[PDB]
Design an enzyme around this catalytic site. Structure first.
Site, PDB file in Angstrom:
ATOM      1  N   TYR B  18    -100.869 -23.195  12.366  1.00 42.65           N
ATOM      2  CA  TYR B  18    -100.331 -22.296  13.377  1.00 42.65           C
ATOM      3  C   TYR B  18     -99.338 -21.352  12.723  1.00 42.65           C
ATOM      4  O   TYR B  18     -99.405 -20.149  12.930  1.00 42.65           O
ATOM      5  CB  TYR B  18     -99.645 -23.065  14.520  1.00 42.65           C
ATOM      6  CG  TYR B  18     -99.021 -22.154  15.562  1.00 42.65           C
ATOM      7  CD1 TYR B  18     -97.701 -21.711  15.440  1.00 42.65           C
ATOM      8  CD2 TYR B  18     -99.766 -21.702  16.644  1.00 42.65           C
ATOM      9  CE1 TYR B  18     -97.148 -20.838  16.373  1.00 42.65           C
ATOM     10  CE2 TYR B  18     -99.224 -20.826  17.584  1.00 42.65           C
ATOM     11  CZ  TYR B  18     -97.916 -20.396  17.445  1.00 42.65           C
ATOM     12  OH  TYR B  18     -97.380 -19.522  18.373  1.00 42.65           O
ATOM     13  N   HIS B  22     -99.346 -16.788  11.525  1.00 38.33           N
ATOM     14  CA  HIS B  22     -98.390 -15.774  11.960  1.00 38.33           C
ATOM     15  C   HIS B  22     -97.638 -15.119  10.807  1.00 38.33           C
ATOM     16  O   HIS B  22     -96.677 -14.377  11.016  1.00 38.33           O
ATOM     17  CB  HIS B  22     -97.381 -16.362  12.949  1.00 38.33           C
ATOM     18  CG  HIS B  22     -97.991 -16.794  14.246  1.00 38.33           C
ATOM     19  ND1 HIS B  22     -98.848 -17.870  14.346  1.00 38.33           N
ATOM     20  CD2 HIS B  22     -97.890 -16.275  15.493  1.00 38.33           C
ATOM     21  CE1 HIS B  22     -99.249 -17.993  15.600  1.00 38.33           C
ATOM     22  NE2 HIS B  22     -98.683 -17.038  16.318  1.00 38.33           N
ATOM     23  N   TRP B  76    -107.528 -12.402  19.806  1.00 33.93           N
ATOM     24  CA  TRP B  76    -106.485 -13.199  19.169  1.00 33.93           C
ATOM     25  C   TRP B  76    -106.379 -14.538  19.898  1.00 33.93           C
ATOM     26  O   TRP B  76    -106.380 -15.600  19.281  1.00 33.93           O
ATOM     27  CB  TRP B  76    -105.141 -12.487  19.238  1.00 33.93           C
ATOM     28  CG  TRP B  76    -103.982 -13.325  18.764  1.00 33.93           C
ATOM     29  CD1 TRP B  76    -103.042 -13.949  19.542  1.00 33.93           C
ATOM     30  CD2 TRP B  76    -103.624 -13.602  17.406  1.00 33.93           C
ATOM     31  NE1 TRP B  76    -102.121 -14.592  18.745  1.00 33.93           N
ATOM     32  CE2 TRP B  76    -102.454 -14.394  17.430  1.00 33.93           C
ATOM     33  CE3 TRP B  76    -104.177 -13.255  16.165  1.00 33.93           C
ATOM     34  CZ2 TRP B  76    -101.828 -14.844  16.260  1.00 33.93           C
ATOM     35  CZ3 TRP B  76    -103.550 -13.706  15.001  1.00 33.93           C
ATOM     36  CH2 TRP B  76    -102.391 -14.488  15.060  1.00 33.93           C
ATOM     37  N   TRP B  77    -106.286 -14.488  21.222  1.00 37.49           N
ATOM     38  CA  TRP B  77    -106.169 -15.713  21.995  1.00 37.49           C
ATOM     39  C   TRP B  77    -107.394 -16.610  21.879  1.00 37.49           C
ATOM     40  O   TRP B  77    -107.271 -17.840  21.898  1.00 37.49           O
ATOM     41  CB  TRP B  77    -105.862 -15.384  23.460  1.00 37.49           C
ATOM     42  CG  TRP B  77    -104.407 -15.020  23.699  1.00 37.49           C
ATOM     43  CD1 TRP B  77    -103.356 -15.259  22.862  1.00 37.49           C
ATOM     44  CD2 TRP B  77    -103.851 -14.425  24.880  1.00 37.49           C
ATOM     45  NE1 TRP B  77    -102.177 -14.854  23.445  1.00 37.49           N
ATOM     46  CE2 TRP B  77    -102.450 -14.339  24.683  1.00 37.49           C
ATOM     47  CE3 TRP B  77    -104.399 -13.960  26.086  1.00 37.49           C
ATOM     48  CZ2 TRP B  77    -101.585 -13.803  25.651  1.00 37.49           C
ATOM     49  CZ3 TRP B  77    -103.534 -13.427  27.053  1.00 37.49           C
ATOM     50  CH2 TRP B  77    -102.143 -13.355  26.825  1.00 37.49           C
TER      51      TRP B  77
HETATM   52  C1  LIG Z   1     -98.289 -13.071  18.635  1.00 40.39           C
HETATM   53  C2  LIG Z   1     -98.213 -14.272  19.563  1.00 40.39           C
HETATM   54  O1  LIG Z   1     -98.892 -15.355  18.906  1.00 40.39           O
HETATM   55  C3  LIG Z   1     -98.820 -14.023  20.954  1.00 40.39           C
HETATM   56  O2  LIG Z   1     -98.076 -13.019  21.633  1.00 40.39           O
HETATM   57  C4  LIG Z   1     -98.779 -15.309  21.775  1.00 40.39           C
HETATM   58  O3  LIG Z   1     -99.420 -15.106  23.027  1.00 40.39           O
HETATM   59  C5  LIG Z   1     -99.463 -16.437  21.006  1.00 40.39           C
HETATM   60  O4  LIG Z   1    -100.846 -16.144  20.846  1.00 40.39           O
HETATM   61  C6  LIG Z   1     -98.786 -16.581  19.633  1.00 40.39           C
HETATM   62  O5  LIG Z   1     -99.392 -17.579  18.894  1.00 40.39           O
END
Ligand SMILES: C[C@H](O)[C@H](O)[C@@H](O)[C@@H](O)C=O
Ligand SMILES: C[C@H](O)[C@H](O)[C@@H](O)[C@@H](O)C=O
EC number: 5.1.3.32
Lengths: 104, 104
Positions: B18, B22, B76-77
């Site tokens: 995780y 980032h 992304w999600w």
């Molecule tokens: C950049 C950030 O990660 C995002 O805004 C969050 O919703 C989550 O996905 C983070 O892991």
């Protein structure tokens, strides 16, 4: 500055009282926190988990650590034991969090 | 600006992954976050509890909310579902925290 975050806990029946006690905190405690280099000290309550998420920027690790030695922080922590779990020395039960992301 | 704090969860076996994801996050996601008015977006990991405490300053509630409508946030999600609990729409399981203290 140095970004520091930690988490503490709060009694399930003291959510309102815990918040009221910080609005405002004792003026002499505020003075001491500022004198010891704290900036943007923020605490957030996780109502479902009885958790308190804190974030604070400090100028010095040692100075921040020295707050525990002051009388006002000591009496503040003694005072706060009735609304949250505390260590034997009266400091709140707390754990240091690890920064995993930061976007200015 | 408006200070917003929330908490999410992370799989017990994905703490390292995780964090690695980032550093850095996708450049197009950073661009989108900034375009939508986010500032000082910080996320802290609570290793003992598998919790992620996040804090972000935003210029607009609506704009911040609009990030979920973008393709990049969506992919992304979807991508992040393999390391943390997610809602059916793929957004991370999350809860809004209540600010109880703030000392500039
Ligand atoms: C950049 C950030 O990660 C995002 O805004 C969050 O919703 C989550 O996905 C983070 O892991
Ligand atoms: C001002 C702040 O409360 C203090 O720094 C913490 O240790 C805890 O006692 C807060 O409830």
């Amino acid at each position: 500055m140095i970004r520091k975050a930690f988490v503490m806990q709060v009694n399930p029946d003291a959510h309102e009282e815990y918040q009221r006690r910080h609005n405002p905190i004792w003026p002499e405690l505020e003075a001491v926190l500022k004198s010891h280099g704290a900036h943007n000290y923020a605490i957030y309550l996780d109502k479902a988990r009885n958790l308190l998420f804190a974030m604070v920027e400090i100028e010095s690790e040692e100075r921040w650590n020295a707050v525990a030695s002051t009388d006002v922080c000591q009496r503040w922590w003694k005072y706060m034991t009735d609304v949250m779990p505390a260590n034997p020395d009266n400091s709140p039960v707390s754990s240091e969090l690890q920064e995993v992301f930061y976007l200015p």
